[PDB]
Design an enzyme around this catalytic site. Sequence first.
Site, PDB file in Angstrom:
ATOM      1  N   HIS A 173       0.805  -1.212   0.000  1.00 12.72           N
ATOM      2  CA  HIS A 173       0.000   0.000   0.000  1.00 12.72           C
ATOM      3  C   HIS A 173       0.861   1.296   0.000  1.00 12.72           C
ATOM      4  O   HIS A 173       0.334   2.394  -0.212  1.00 12.72           O
ATOM      5  CB  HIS A 173      -1.129  -0.045   1.062  1.00 12.72           C
ATOM      6  CG  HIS A 173      -0.681   0.191   2.475  1.00 12.72           C
ATOM      7  ND1 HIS A 173      -0.959  -0.690   3.502  1.00 12.72           N
ATOM      8  CD2 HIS A 173      -0.050   1.245   3.042  1.00 12.72           C
ATOM      9  CE1 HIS A 173      -0.500  -0.197   4.639  1.00 12.72           C
ATOM     10  NE2 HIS A 173       0.066   0.974   4.385  1.00 12.72           N
TER      11      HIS A 173
ATOM     12  N   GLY B 275       2.024   5.723  10.489  1.00 15.87           N
ATOM     13  CA  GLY B 275       3.465   5.695  10.224  1.00 15.87           C
ATOM     14  C   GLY B 275       4.104   4.380  10.623  1.00 15.87           C
ATOM     15  O   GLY B 275       5.254   4.117  10.265  1.00 15.87           O
TER      16      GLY B 275
ATOM     17  N   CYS C 273       3.235   1.282   9.737  1.00 13.84           N
ATOM     18  CA  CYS C 273       3.164   0.199   8.756  1.00 13.84           C
ATOM     19  C   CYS C 273       4.559  -0.260   8.382  1.00 13.84           C
ATOM     20  O   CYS C 273       5.488   0.551   8.268  1.00 13.84           O
ATOM     21  CB  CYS C 273       2.367   0.620   7.525  1.00 13.84           C
ATOM     22  SG  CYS C 273       0.688   1.040   7.995  1.00 13.84           S
TER      23      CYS C 273
END
Lengths: 303, 303
Positions: B41, B143, B145
């Site tokens: 993503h 933030g 991920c």
Amino acid sequence: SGFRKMAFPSGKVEGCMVQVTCGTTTLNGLWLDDTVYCPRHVICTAEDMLNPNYEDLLIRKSNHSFLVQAGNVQLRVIGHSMQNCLLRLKVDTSNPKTPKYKFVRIQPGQTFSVLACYNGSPSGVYQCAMRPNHTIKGSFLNGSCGSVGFNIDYDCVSFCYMHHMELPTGVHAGTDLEGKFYGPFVDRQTAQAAGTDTTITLNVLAWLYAAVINGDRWFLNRFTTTLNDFNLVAMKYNYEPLTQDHVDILGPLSAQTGIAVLDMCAALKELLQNGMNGRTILGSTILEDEFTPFDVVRQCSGA
Amino acid sequence: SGFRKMAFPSGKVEGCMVQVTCGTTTLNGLWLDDTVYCPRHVICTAEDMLNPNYEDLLIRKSNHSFLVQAGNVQLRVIGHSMQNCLLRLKVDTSNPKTPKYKFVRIQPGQTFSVLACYNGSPSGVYQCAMRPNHTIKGSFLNGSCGSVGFNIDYDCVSFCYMHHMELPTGVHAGTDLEGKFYGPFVDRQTAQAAGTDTTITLNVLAWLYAAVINGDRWFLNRFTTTLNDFNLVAMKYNYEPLTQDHVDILGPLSAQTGIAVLDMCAALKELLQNGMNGRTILGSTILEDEFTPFDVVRQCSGA
Ligand SMILES: CCC(C)(C)NC(=O)[C@@H](c1cccn1C)N(C(=O)Cn1nnc2ccccc21)c1ccc(NC(C)=O)cc1
Ligand SMILES: CCC(C)(C)NC(=O)[C@@H](c1cccn1C)N(C(=O)Cn1nnc2ccccc21)c1ccc(NC(C)=O)cc1
């Protein structure tokens, strides 16, 4: 979202851990620049532990009496001296992985991360508080002496604890990195016991603010209290008195959430007097006291 | 003595964390040998998140579209490909700090350490369980991920989780390191929700054995139970059924403590039906289910 007991990443400290052997005793040391720090009891026989004259025991030791290993690399001891309850072993190699660091003596109620180590090898990391009675409720087995506690602030490691012993009730005692014990404890065989402990009021209030930030609000009420009236309830339930300093420290969390410090105190007072009535707070049925206001702010971060 | 929620030391993983930027989005990646792994993503605009065709979105990206930083050192991307829900970014430099490692897909009920990271910089470490509903109850902000979960076995790091998203109830979802999600979740904007969860019976029983090892024994009784009769009480209180496999796994703890598995089940059954009557177990008033039998044995160690 979420709120977890969280430790600092341990890598900068792992790079400093070494194994220190004196005769049949092995424990851990902390290698910073050209010095290895470790508990002075490493030099003792079992018999010496009963009435050690450390000054005199150390004088009979040689640099060659100490075997220091960093990983699988032997570090040669070139000097030895004592500082309070620590040995300082000067070594032939400066640690190239020495982080930016400070030695700090922490205050009761403050939290830190512990890197549990055995034979100079890190085994686990966890978050602790220094209890009001100057012990920590750690997880340590024989061989763990010399394991350290620390906080990290912008790549600087503040070392605050070195492990020396377990007490009869199974809690743990040690020194700062100047080798001065936390609490009345001594590094020799005596009938010493941890004193009675207290719940860390400021931390409980912090953790209630964390709950609010995370969406648990059910304990907020319309009740108010004064500092005096709250401290009556604190005393009954074996909580530390709340002070004006403590109120000031809670300012930022109070402003973020819009809940006045004394209003949160009214929420805590009702929780103390009445229980949870089948409810939980951040998945807990107990009132957690091992998060400081700083821990809450650090972990919940900005927006 | 003592029993703590304990994480693995995080250093070997800290040495693998990098920052991955694509346009205005920055998150974390894992740098092993000459590959950086991160959530796919990262390539999406906010609009793309509503109905992403990842294959087609990736084809329009260039190696030059990705900015990868290890500390303050830029790593040049020389190839990009997709594996399930992960991007694999081939880079010009092999990570010299790559540990011995494996990728494993863990099973519900198993535990692991999470190294929470932001902007490629480690911020904290904590211990989690993979819940029966395939989420984790983590602590993650925007933030985070690309933060990973792992276990360590004799210097080998088994990576088991990479963080992708938070769900509406505030629990967390991600993939293994082959990029396959745990649970029915998808990396796009939908009304997906965590399913109903269950208490991890095997872990509760482990934690009761840990209590016994540490000196808390008050819940042991003279009652006996069968597996069938225990599972009736499990079902009522939203616990996973106990299986014969589970009984076998508890063998070593049962032998160490001398308490038969079904006898501990009788202790748990009474705890479920009656409460603690004002008592605590390892300082808890709740029945903890995020320690596996292996965690208990590892932490209580030998003798
Ligand atoms: C834990 C049991 C009791 C309360 C008896 N204390 C000690 O054994 C103690 C100690 C014994 C004598 C003086 N002290 C301070 N000690 C450690 O705790 C050490 N320790 N630290 N964390 C521990 C966790 C579990 C067990 C022992 C632990 C310790 C320290 C050094 C020695 N040295 C030699 C040569 O025998 C022996 C025991
Ligand atoms: C947490 C709030 C909700 C439930 C709405 N989910 C998302 O925002 C989610 C998402 C939004 C759309 C699709 N998904 C999977 N997402 C993250 O969770 C991300 N995330 N992961 N851990 C988090 C912790 C707190 C907040 C967001 C977090 C996320 C992921 C990528 C994007 N990308 C872009 C370009 O907008 C945006 C949001």
